[PDB]
Design a protein around this ligand. Structure first.
Ligand SMILES: [Mg+2]
Ligand SMILES: [Mg+2]
Ligand SMILES: [Mg+2]
Ligand SMILES: [Mg+2]
Lengths: 468, 468, 468
């Protein structure tokens, strides 16, 4: 590979880390010496067993090392070691979505199923994943019970706790960590290092902004928008960076939504634009400078949202975030200037950008699978000229004139989201981007997560039911 | 020795560590000054007493310092010190096996026997030994009772445990921990160091891959295939490297199978090939690119498997791995695409280097004895044109269509495996590779292991029987 | 029931504790009001569910309350509560062994089959169950490992231990503690109370002797022989008494064999006699006052012993006691004055008390199932005139003629015993005493015990295999 192989030469690296992504959206890695890696290897690939997506088949799939980009020197590890975050998973014959389905290939499929539709040359995604960093996190589940504890200095409740260096008393109050200065912020240099590591990985520029999110211990770093299968890869790399930098500060990072109860959850707003021969088609004048194309994109999403939630909100925990609150994207509507609207139109102040922002996804979403599903739903909108309705700007979450009551909402539970997907999977199967078998599997696999939650008695049930 | 003696000169080493292997397969060492090491030493050798090898009278035996491939530089000890990882153990009257039997000699024989039978000039072995690394391990047995505890940060059950740097929460789930990214992985750097040490010992290349195995705390490093004897020497060196690198990380490594219950045990798959005049004899068109030769090799293994188990699975603990879980390759048959198959045929993109994999051996095998046993049984197959029967491509396990009931299995216990060996030792005695006296000794010595287990009450015998 | 119902009247008891035994030989109980209990109850019985074994379509089975030999006025509980130590379990269709098979019924069956063959009117059992009493006992099995710890002041390894009232220094040495006087022997007083409670339960006399057994903390109380079924009921009652009296000393009792390794295990010798017209059939002038009948009884037992072991030694732990040692009745032969002999002929002085003693059974034996199986095997001997061979009181294992290898031994493992039973169940099936279905179930149930042991890594495996 021009990128990879040359990088190997320049780095004098002895080790090459093949990284791919599982159905649940967890990056995985296997490490090879540089000696085995040739240009032909990008074609031929390196083969391996299937133990996460598949089973029974005794599957001996191949890791077709993908080449352009994602050729990043492993910033954290000691020995010079580039990564190939680009490892599409191919069956032995039919060079295709390996195991049940390789997300990256599903996303590649969707890449083609946009030019093929002749709607657009490229699609651009700009996710805003939120994370929490804690000092330490502990949990256990037995017959004895279930228990989980968050530990952090910056935690709102840490006033009154004893510390080695002493307690500064300077910490964010609940919900009140929106940008206060460093005495209380107690991050900054960490975020900076995170940013520096990102730049090592993806490239120069790319990192837009770093700020403290509302909840105690909650941070946001902004990464530039990119095409799918690029941005998707970069999401995984972002996660990696923040995890490891935190670890170097003896702290732990989690992209889970609502880890903390009674403060803000972590959400992954997804900015979206479509381009054709380098013109953003979302530009127009229909709503606040939106093309009918964009309006159709919207509203396809609204139609298929509940089903989309399985993919965009694929964790039981996601629905802890999706509760009746303001700044909670629960209500399926669109408005540039309304919170609680599931969709927002960010003020581009210039027709060039014209993104649309979907606030309902959380970082638990498999980037590949998630971005793809949004597109499929989006284009179903355009194809079937699905009207997004009229933009509700006036009321976030307030009185019911029957209307807001009548307004559709996002899914209440993963259970429900999976039932939704069962009903409405057609748009995905378009272009053969999503095979039914994959969807079947996915749903069953995710159901085990649901099973866990539903089976395991919750501490709160003691509170409600113990003495009845 | 051109290698050794020259290395001594080049290293400016003051000491040479002579290493051999005991019956039980544990490398042993004695250290002599380099001044004592001349060319004549290689012929004459150095004298020493008899322990473990069951010497017992006629005690003074000799260490024929051999020449290993780049006789390891210290790679761990203080002074610069070469080790001659190879030191064939030679009897006072004559030259060959000492006391009951030197494994290395047994392996030297059988190298010859292949050529003697004229079926091939060279035999190729490529083991995949799995190991665990724990932070710490404790056990004790008294009259009071019998107790063992595994301690590790990366252990899946360590969520909720207290640590100095504080609990990261980032650790493998049970059976998960197949290739997650480093926050969870933890052992990247350590595996890398292990690899580096291996290369110090066995020189460049030689290291195929490093990944995290399924079980929490379980790691795999891939080492290149080699001839019998050489590969056996390299197995010992691999074990040594991983042990010591772990020790430098203040951790402990064990090659025992199933130390941890209810997650994967550690197994040593053995890739095997026969070559004659530098051509892969296993390549053909009989089954999935297999020569009749290979098919016959397979048959013999299958026939003698239970007896083979005494050598390939020579620990009571081995049989904790070899269980009805369809994961455990207990069923004696062959297929490229079947997990339950004791023997698997790996997909080779090119017919050169066609091999067969025996998944049933575990790292407790004394590689010398055992590479040997595989060959002897293999060639008995070829010699008697033993047909392996049909390949079980269809089904690993179903609602028992009888069939699976009728399917042959490996052995249930070391006890049984030793009984098996007693009955079926003939193939081994061919070539005089294995003396009866050696087998008789082996059996008795390993019986003491069985005695221990069967004599000592086990904690579970309290679970089941205490209140009865 | 004359006795039960009257007892209820006399006691002014408000409660009746209906007790039966499971396949595994553990007393079970349900407690019902005395108002619920009429004469009709003894005919009709009370219904209950089956989760114990033989999960059916549904297990509506009936507890035929069975007026015992002295239904116990009870002794431990506060409110006066008679127990009907007997409750045969009866199937709704018909009235026989419910579920797989009620042991008590199976035992009654064997009582009848004796008379059916006309060999004898009555069969007599006198078991000598040995137990340990410890101050406290702990164990746990996790992924972390396996542990178990025995704790007692009297334990021989407590010589150096710290005590509240201060260490006396006066305790049994290992194996010593065969009848030292009370300063060392902690159990006078406790054994006495145990005896007193037994008399409460089984009425006056009945208790023959109380002494300290060899091993530290090991005690023996002697209870008079009785008929099959009666004695099996009394076994259960004896266990109950000693358990609960110990609990009143804040201590714990276990009838498990070999709880403590490297001192004596706990064994249940079964003295056996047959009568017809109130005349001892065993008395004669064959050998040490034995009738040919008795000699034939012996033969059958010896013939079927390995299969008998499934019943007489039904715990994996049993084989910790049945280990090649002196004082360990592993050898299948008979003598008056020779140990090592599985069967012994006790010195009666006056015949009519002529018995045979089988020393190989342990207290894990289901008394009902055990007594039964011994009879069936015994009478198969008589029926087929199976010759016991020569009495081996010549010499112990002191002289191995190498024919000692050929000398038959009891089973080495529960696993083996179950394989034995599979092969040799015919004697049991005679008279329809034992259903095939019951035996088939039994075998499978006990296999789970074997599975446990074989699956769970033992502390000692760490000792042997960890650092290899
Ligand atoms: Mg934000
Ligand atoms: Mg935002
Ligand atoms: Mg006794
Ligand atoms: Mg006795």
């Amino acid at each position: 590979a021009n990128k990879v192989l040359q990088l190997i030469q320049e780095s004098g690296a002895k080790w090459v880390d093949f990284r791919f992504t599982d159905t649940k959206g967890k990056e995985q890695h296997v490490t090879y010496p540089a000696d085995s890696i040739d240009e032909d290897t990008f074609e031929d690939g390196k083969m391996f067993d299937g133990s996460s997506i598949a089973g029974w088949k005794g599957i001996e799939a191949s890791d077709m090392i993908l080449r352009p980009d994602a050729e990043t020197g492993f910033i954290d590890p000691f020995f010079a070691e580039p990564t190939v975050v680009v490892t599409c998973d191919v069956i032995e014959p039919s060079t295709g979505q390996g195991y049940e389905r390789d997300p990256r290939s599903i996303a590649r499929r969707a890449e083609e199923y946009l030019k093929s539709t002749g709607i657009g040359d490229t699609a651009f995604f700009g996710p805003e994943p939120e994370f929490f960093v804690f000092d330490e996190v502990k949990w256990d589940i037995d017959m004895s019970g279930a228990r989980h504890t968050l530990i952090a200095e910056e935690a709102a409740w840490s006033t009154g706790k004893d510390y080695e260096s002493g307690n500064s008393g300077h910490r964010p109050r609940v919900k009140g960590g929106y940008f206060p200065v460093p005495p209380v912020d107690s991050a900054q240099d960490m975020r900076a290092e995170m940013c520096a590591k990102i730049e090592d990985i993806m490239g120069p520029g790319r990192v837009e902004v770093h700020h403290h999110e509302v909840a105690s211990c909650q941070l946001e770093i902004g990464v530039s928008f990119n095409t799918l299968v690029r941005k998707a890869d970069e999401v995984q790399q972002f996660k990696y960076a923040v995890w490891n930098v935190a670890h170097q500060y003896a702290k732990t990072a989690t992209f889970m939504p609502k880890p903390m109860v009674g403060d803000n959850g972590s959400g992954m707003h997804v900015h979206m634009s479509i381009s054709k021969d380098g013109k953003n088609l979302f530009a127009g004048d229909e709503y606040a400078g939106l093309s009918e194309m964009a309006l159709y994109f919207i509203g396809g999403i609204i139609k298929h949202a509940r089903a989309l939630n399985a993919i965009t909100n694929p964790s039981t925990n996601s629905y802890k975030r999706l509760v009746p609150h303001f700044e909670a994207p629960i209500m399926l509507a669109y408005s540039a200037r309304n919170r609680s609207a599931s969709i927002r139109i960010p003020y581009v102040s210039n027709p060039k950008g014209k993104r649309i922002e979907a606030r309902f996804p959380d970082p638990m979403m498999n980037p590949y699978l998630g971005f793809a599903a949004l597109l499929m739903a989006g284009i179903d909108g355009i194809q079937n000229k699905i009207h997004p309705g009229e933009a509700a700007d006036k009321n976030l979450y307030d009185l019911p004139p029957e209307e807001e009551a009548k307004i559709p909402t996002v899914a209440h539970s993963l259970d429900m989201a999976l039932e939704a997907l069962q009903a409405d999977h057609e748009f995905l199967l378009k272009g053969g981007v999503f095979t039914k078998e994959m969807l079947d599997a996915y749903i069953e696999l995710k159901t085990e997560d649901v099973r866990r939650l539903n089976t395991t008695t919750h501490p709160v049930e003691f509170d409600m039911y113990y003495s009845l």
